[PDB]
């Protein structure tokens, strides 16, 4: 149930001693290492051509956040603050009130993307599939406050990415 790495007593007959002396003087293992490096020289490299070729992902991927809507235009978020209660970094700030037709809707849904740890506890806490952590990872900014998302930015990300987000959820909701 165990093995001894490096417990070989080397043979001391003239054959093996001459083999080790030929290895020392004629550099046989150094040529072995050069041969392995030469063997990688003629392999095809593993380099994809970004931006034109993209790394492989899956529908579970946790990227840029988005607020979703129903298939009627009504937003799914009903202000229950489960996402900001489960949020391990407290990135989500929510304020709510009843709007003009008496629905329970938010008036503040902030996600600080520079506190966010991108773990997706918010999208699994969410009982209506309102918040998701979508598929976008290419959203780097030149300014820090451009990563302080409000409700308008998250709803625009949902409107922007819904055609992909809905198909990823369609691929993955049976595991959830």
């Amino acid at each position: 149930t165990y093995k001894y790495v490096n417990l070989r007593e080397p043979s001391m007959d003239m054959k093996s001693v001459t083999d080790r002396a030929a290895q020392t003087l004629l550099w046989t293992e150094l040529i072995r290492g050069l041969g392995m490096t030469l063997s990688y020289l003629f392999r095809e490299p593993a380099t994809i051509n970004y931006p034109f070729e993209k790394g492989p992902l899956s529908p579970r991927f946790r990227g840029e956040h988005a607020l979703r809507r129903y298939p009627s235009g009504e937003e799914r978020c009903i202000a229950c603050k489960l996402c900001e209660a489960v949020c391990p970094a407290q990135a989500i700030t929510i304020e709510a009130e009843p709007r003009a037709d008496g629905s329970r809707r938010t008036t503040r849904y902030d996600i600080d993307m520079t506190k966010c740890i991108y773990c997706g506890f918010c999208q699994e806490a969410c009982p209506v599939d309102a918040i998701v952590e979508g598929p976008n990872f290419e959203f780097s900014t030149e300014t820090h406050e451009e990563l302080l998302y409000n409700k308008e930015k998250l709803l625009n990300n949902g409107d922007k990415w819904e055609a992909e987000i809905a198909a990823n959820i369609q691929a993955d909701y049976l595991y959830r």
Binding site: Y70, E74, S103, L155
Partner: protein
């Protein structure tokens, strides 16, 4: 259903707009105020009221497990339609 303040600033679906004498409009100077122009309160009001023949209807939002939790809406009041508390879809007993 966006509208505009007299300062030329868009008013959000919440109703947020800065005052004229508020300095914090300077953050949009040379840039843009990002609002979403699909107001959900105007979009759910475009949905037609569903006529049903029962007294209690169930609603899950459509999609089954992809919608909201399935709730049960009573429809005894004929003065008012019965609204889903999650999705806002409204129902009427046709009798």
């Amino acid at each position: 259903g966006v509208r505009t303040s007299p300062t030329g600033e868009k008013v959000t679906h919440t109703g947020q707009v800065y005052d004229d004498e508020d300095y914090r409009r300077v953050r949009f100077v040379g840039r843009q105020k990002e609002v979403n122009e699909n107001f959900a309160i105007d979009l759910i009001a475009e949905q037609p009221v569903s006529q049903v023949g029962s007294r209690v209807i169930s609603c899950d939002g459509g999609g089954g497990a992809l919608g909201h939790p399935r709730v049960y809406i009573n429809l005894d009041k004929e003065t008012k339609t019965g609204t889903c508390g999650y999705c806002g879809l409204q129902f009427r007993q046709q009798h």
